[PDB]
Structure 1
Amino acid sequence: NSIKTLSNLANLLAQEGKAEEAIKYMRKAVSLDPNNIKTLSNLANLLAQEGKAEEAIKYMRKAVSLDPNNIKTLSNLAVLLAQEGKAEEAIKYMRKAVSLIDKAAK
């Protein structure tokens, strides 16, 4: 009945091994607001948890696109890309994160 409740429900479903249903509900949560970076990150984390790494990368990329100066999102995307063997992209986003950290340092 709300984004948060559908997300938590999806999480509970995932814990009990109900992968398909979990993804279904998490996708509903995203559908209520497709531009919510938090929900997108949650869905990407669920998809990655269920071995669907490419979709996870897709939604992480969208989350990045919505706010590209987000060090955390960049790092997560980079880790996912690295795990899947996409070295150049991973190093790219990690270097972006480094650049932002540098900006904060100065």
Structure 2
Amino acid sequence: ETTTIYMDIGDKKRTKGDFDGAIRAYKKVLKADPNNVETLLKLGKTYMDIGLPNDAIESLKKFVVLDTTSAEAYYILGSANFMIDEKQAAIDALQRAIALNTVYADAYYKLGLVYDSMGEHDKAIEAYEKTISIKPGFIRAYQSIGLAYEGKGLRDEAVKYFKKALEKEEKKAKY
């Protein structure tokens, strides 16, 4: 019961943006139920929300030990690593997300962002092209390829991608 009561109190607080309060509630669940993976993930995300990525990483690591086959958890872990410039740690976690779900569009996209940040613009473009192969409406992937091409001085190819991103934006907006 403690687990249900306080998980529900925490979500309510997190939803209202009372992140310190949600943390207290989630901590209370984990007192009784240290292996609660759902709260480990919520706590991790909430730590990310208040700018404490190392604490996020700790909580997400605990999750992934207990449930090793959640692509989402590895995606989030990867994102938290990226926030503290642990770029290879981000890559590794995102590659595990992708291995678990090879059609995980968001993980491919983030992987591209991590490659871009490392100066690895050709692997970034590939990661972005994979993203669009999964979700052809993933606008930010067209935009990021566009900008990768601007970086390469392929300015007409960049404009093709910017126009394609616009086309997708317009189709979206008209529904």
Give the shorter-chain TM-score range: 0.7 to 0.9
Superposition deviation, residue 15 in structure 1: 4.8
CA distance in structure 1 between the partners assigned to 2:16 and 2:95 by the alignment: 38
Give me the identity figure in percent.
23
In structure 1, the partner of 2:23 is: 23
In structure 2, the partner of 1:79 is: 79
Superposition deviation, residue 18 in structure 1: 4.4
What is the one-letter code of the residue matched to 2:95?
R
Give yes or no for the alignment of 1:101 onto 2:118. no
Q: What TM-score results when the alignment is normalised by the length of structure 1? A: 0.80
Flag the structure with more relative contact order, 1 or 2, with Cα contacts below 8 A and sequence separation at least 6. 1
In structure 2, the partner of 1:53 is: 53
Q: What TM-score results when the alignment is normalised by the length of structure 2? A: 0.52
What is the one-letter code of the residue matched to 2:42?
N
The structure with the largest alpha-carbon Rg is: 2
Distance 1:21 1:74, change over 3 A: same
Where does the alignment leave 5 or more consecutive residues of structure 2 unmatched? 103-175
Superposition deviation, residue 84 in structure 1: 2.1
Where does the alignment leave 5 or more consecutive residues of structure 1 unmatched? none
What is the one-letter code of the residue matched to 1:69?
T
2:68 is paired with a residue whose SS is coil
My pick for the range that moved more, 54-63 or 42-51, is 42-51
CA shift digits 1:16-43 (9 cap, x unpaired): 5544333222100112211111111011
In structure 2, the partner of 1:90 is: 90
